[PDB]
Amino acid sequence: KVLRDNIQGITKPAIRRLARRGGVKRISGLIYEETRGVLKVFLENVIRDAVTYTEHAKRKTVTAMDVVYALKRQGRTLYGFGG
Amino acid sequence: KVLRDNIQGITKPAIRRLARRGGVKRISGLIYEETRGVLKVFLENVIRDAVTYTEHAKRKTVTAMDVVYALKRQGRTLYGFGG
Amino acid sequence: KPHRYRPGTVALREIRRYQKSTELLIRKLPFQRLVREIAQDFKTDLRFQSSAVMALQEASEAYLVGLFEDTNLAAIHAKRVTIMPKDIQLARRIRGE
Amino acid sequence: KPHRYRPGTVALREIRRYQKSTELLIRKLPFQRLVREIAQDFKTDLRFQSSAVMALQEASEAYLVGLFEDTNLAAIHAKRVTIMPKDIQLARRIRGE
Amino acid sequence: KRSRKESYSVYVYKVLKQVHPDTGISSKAMGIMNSFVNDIFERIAGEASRLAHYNKRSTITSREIQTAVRLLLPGELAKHAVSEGTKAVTKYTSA
Amino acid sequence: KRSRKESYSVYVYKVLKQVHPDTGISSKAMGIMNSFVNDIFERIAGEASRLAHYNKRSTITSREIQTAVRLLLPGELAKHAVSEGTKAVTKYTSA
Amino acid sequence: ARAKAKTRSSRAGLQFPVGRVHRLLRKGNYSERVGAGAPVYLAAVLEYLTAEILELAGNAARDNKKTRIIPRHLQLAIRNDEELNKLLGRVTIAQGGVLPNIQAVLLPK
Amino acid sequence: ARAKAKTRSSRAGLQFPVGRVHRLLRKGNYSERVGAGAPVYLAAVLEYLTAEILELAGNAARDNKKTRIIPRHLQLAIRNDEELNKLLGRVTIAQGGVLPNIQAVLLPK
DNA sequence: TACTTACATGACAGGATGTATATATCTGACACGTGCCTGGAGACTAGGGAGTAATCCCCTTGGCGGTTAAAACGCGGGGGACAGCGCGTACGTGCGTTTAAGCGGTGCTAGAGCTGTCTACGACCAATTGAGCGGCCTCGGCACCGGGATTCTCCAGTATGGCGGCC
DNA sequence: GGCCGCCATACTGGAGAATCCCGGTGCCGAGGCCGCTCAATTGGTCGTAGACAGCTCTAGCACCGCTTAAACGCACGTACGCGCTGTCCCCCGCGTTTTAACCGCCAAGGGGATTACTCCCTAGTCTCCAGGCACGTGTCAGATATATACATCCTGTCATGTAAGTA
């Protein structure tokens, strides 16, 4: 029922490709785990707010629009999912 | 009554004092004019907002509440001036 | 002799291609499972719209690429071509986090 | 011989002396003259509440202090103590200026 | 059917045919401009509410909106927005 | 002739002497407190307005405020505030 | 005996719905009364920004020889206008990609 | 002939005004209608928040052997609490200075 | 000692191959036609909010006389920044293998979302009160000041380690 | 090799100025008390918002199956980060001088805010109509495919920096 490790699912070559999109030419092996940690922290910060929206909405299925609300709260407003 | 060179009125030792409050030990010679320019830009933005407030308020005297709101809109909210 | 590129060249080609390309670089389904397992860390048995999963995704990679641009800025400010995590920690402190 | 401290000793004494301090580090009258000077360019004959002048003073001082905090974080990141304006530009541009 | 949800499809399309009669548009980009117009509308609306609070004004007028534009919009964007809105409000004032 | 300006002086004075009977105060410290109470008040009020808009609620209740507390107020302070607020609405309904 | 119901957008000679914006501000909790020229001015500003952005988007589409507006075109247009850039610095475009940005120190000799 | 005047702030047993916070929320144009538990919950939150502010200010003053709160005490009170820091990362304090903060590289040897 | 010259590693000069560059296609999202109802709109109208006049007074602005505080200038000096080269290094790149992601294909009901009720639920007005703010003054905690103690900091005699030379 | 003697380098005590720190004195602003006033509440009332029930139907979830991108892991080529030494220079510290900032004092009036009057405006409501949304449905731009050029970056050769012979 429960899952224990899917932060591994954000794979190392995916991080590598993003750093290519982010413009990194050389990536230490120490980079991947701490990038996983900081994205982990950020996603927790987002999803905690999103869940707070969700039981504020009395719902059990998470919608994208509350994700938009949480991102706009945290100053990382995303275009393409509102409404 | 016109003023021309009061950016030099923010003195070099005042810059040193501020960096001591910032905890800066050693300060290069190129620092001071760059600090003058960036503080000039910051002040220009803030009082541009404040002057916009004041002309929108149909006033002539710059008030500290306008300073407070201008700093709020730049995300630099200040406590201690009647806010 | 089989062909082999000098270091950075494929890195730079990847840089150019994903700066040109716009697609997601992470597999969507492990990301979805990660979303659900951290959801049950706050509330168990939550359900997620797929649009919410990809919206959280493009938000995640955009946040990440912003941090890595700051990381490259610090690293060239650290006079370097290889980034180390202290660049990211520095940038995270600079953003006020 | 007259007493002479080694370079940095008086600097560190200034560090402790101005962190324990709370007073404004700018002379009041030329700062007021400068804000009148710059604001005259945007609108003529502008008058300033003196409290607004000290408000601009303290806000600008703390904004600069936060800037040099970001700067010397970059400097210890850059293994230096003699900060240079590229450090400030790095702090601004990573901050988004 | 379903409930009608308001969107900005047709007005953006009219403006697009004003500026580019020849081109098409993707629906993903269309939702992005819907988010854009809603987001900037929210920014200007909140700013106008702030200034109406500061001036203790119970009514937000085009003076307040112009002030908010001069705040948020940068430079030539602000002044040509002033020009466009001024021309529009003169035409609407002259019906 | 003068006009009254409202400020939160006496309440912060009350709770200070409640928790520290022997402790004095400076007035500009009270200015920083007034700035604090208005700042956090407008943060919570704007977030509550946002939550009322998102869930199509025309009324902002304690659930909205508590939601805004979990959003803006981080962690331990949020749980304490939830605790004394639940106590506070409870004794209020009993009063 | 009422005359023709004319539209306020065409009264302003404009495309954006004046009635929608005025109704939203009446329902948006910003002021209980809204000045008459306020939504007209707002819609004029919105149409001006939207028109210049769509013009840039069409020009960018023509630049990469495409005839349809793409979010990649939106990224490459808005992020390359510096006043639109710092107008929209913290705003994310879905599937917009990134600006082509290589640092000069990263490029070889 | 009339009920005795006993305020809702006394009903909460809390010093922060139920009435004033309620009228500022109603006047602040967030919604035209406000639930009853909203201002009492808000006032409880505010008075509690100010309570730990006053605790930290009191211990800061007791540390610096003054009985009166100075904004330097407020600086030391705010910046030494991680949740208060997360609350007030972008907030500027008048005449507060900074934390006593030196990097280890600045010290001799 | 400089001039020339060799050589070998840094500089000068041309190809495989991944992406760029030429159409062919078939599709389904672009794009356009259609019912509609809801969304905008208009006339009156009741009422409310902002602009305007006066004004005054108090709070800002300019002027002036000294006073060092603050700036300013200059000079000894230690530290700082940092590059050439070196050197252990740390990771990009090749590329085959595994597997679970990806695609695509089914069944179903959880709850998302939409619809009728109904009563909680809370804004609002006249009145009344009580707390809470303007005003003031005043006195004791705190600012300013003088004098040791502490404290820190720079130096210089020194002990000790280390190293060499003679027996 | 031992022994003795000599240099090297930090060990360490000592001393004096800067700042805590202790005691003395005024002063200023906390605070506490007095007078006003407005705001906050209460009772009721009246309109209405959303909570609740409940259906329904639909996409998330679960299950199933074929494919190959993923991925990852080991080898290896190769470039990275930073430090030693040095090196060059750049503000830091430590003064002196000077000047205008500061502080205290004086005169002006600007304008900001306050009250009253006024009148400009804006939404409510009711109804009416039309335009964009929902739906539906053709349809060609491009997604995909196949074939070809050129970068392009790598690879194979120029060149001169520097080492060496010798006039």
Numbering used by the authors:
A (entry chain P), B (entry chain L): 20 to 102
C (entry chain O), D (entry chain K): 37 to 133
E (entry chain N), F (entry chain R): 30 to 124
G (entry chain M), H (entry chain Q): 10 to 118
From the paper:
Here, we report cryo-EM structures of human H1-containing tetranucleosome arrays with four physiologically relevant NRLs. The structures show a zig-zag arrangement of nucleosomes, with nucleosomes 1 and 3 forming a stack. H1 binding to stacked nucleosomes depends on the NRL, whereas H1 always binds to the non-stacked nucleosomes 2 and 4. H1 contacts DNA with L1, the amino-terminal part of α2 together with L3, and α3 to stabilize the nucleosome and contribute to chromatin compaction.
In contrast, the presence of H1 on the stacked nucleosomes 1 and 3 differs between the four arrays. H1 is absent from the stacked nucleosomes of the 4×177 array, but is present on nucleosome 1 in the 4×187 and 4×197 arrays, and is present on both stacked nucleosomes in the 4×207 array. Particularly high Δβ values are found for entry DNA at nucleosome 3, except for the 4×207 array, which is the only array where H1 is observed on nucleosome 3. However, when Δβ was higher, H1 was not bound, likely because a stabilizing contact between loop L1 and linker DNA could not be formed.
